[PDB]
Amino acid sequence: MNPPPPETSNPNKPKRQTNQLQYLLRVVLKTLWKHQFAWPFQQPVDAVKLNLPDYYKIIKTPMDMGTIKKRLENNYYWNAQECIQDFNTMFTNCYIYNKPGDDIVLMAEALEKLFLQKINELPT
Numbered sequence: 001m002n003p004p005p006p007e008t009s010n011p012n013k014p015k016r017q018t019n020q021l022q023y024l025l026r027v028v029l030k031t032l033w034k035h036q037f038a039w040p041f042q043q044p045v046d047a048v049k050l051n052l053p054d055y056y057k058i059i060k061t062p063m064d065m066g067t068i069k070k071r072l073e074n075n076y077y078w079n080a081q082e083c084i085q086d087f088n089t090m091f092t093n094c095y096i097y098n099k100p101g102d103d104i105v106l107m108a109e110a111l112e113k114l115f116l117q118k119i120n121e122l123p124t
């Protein structure tokens with residue numbers, strides 16, 4: 001058993017764009033998603049199939065770019081900060097679980113640099 005994936009639809013929430021949320025989807029997510037190091041982050045960590053028996057012991061808030069993509073596409077987030085918080089969680093999870101020398105960590109770090117390059121140019 002893996003946790004259910006995070007919720008991605010918010011049925012009773014009305015649709016509202018913001019400049020920031022449009023930027024997060026069309027610029028930030030789009031750039032990260034197509035990067036060559038995206039693939040370990042494109043879907044929830046399957047701790048069963050990946051054989052990480054301690055993964056949910058260590059990680060209390062699973063998060064991934066597949067979930068973030070869908071939340072953005074579904075206008076799940078009320079604001080840009082919620083979305084940014086999910087990216088931060090995703091990277092945090094990687095850095096607190098994996099060993100510092102691991103390729104997955106260096107991949108995360110490459111992605112996070114890009115995320116931050118782009119979040120620095122965020123609109124308001």
Ligand SMILES: Cc1cc(-c2nc3sc4c(c3c(=O)[nH]2)CCN(C)C4)cc(C)c1O
Pocket residue numbers: 039040041042043044045046050052093094097098104
């Ligand atoms: C320990 C750990 C494993 C992974 C990880 N590896 C793979 S390998 C693999 C996947 C896949 C995946 O999700 N996630 C999913 C399907 N294919 C792309 C095979 C990701 C992170 C962030 C992590 O901290």
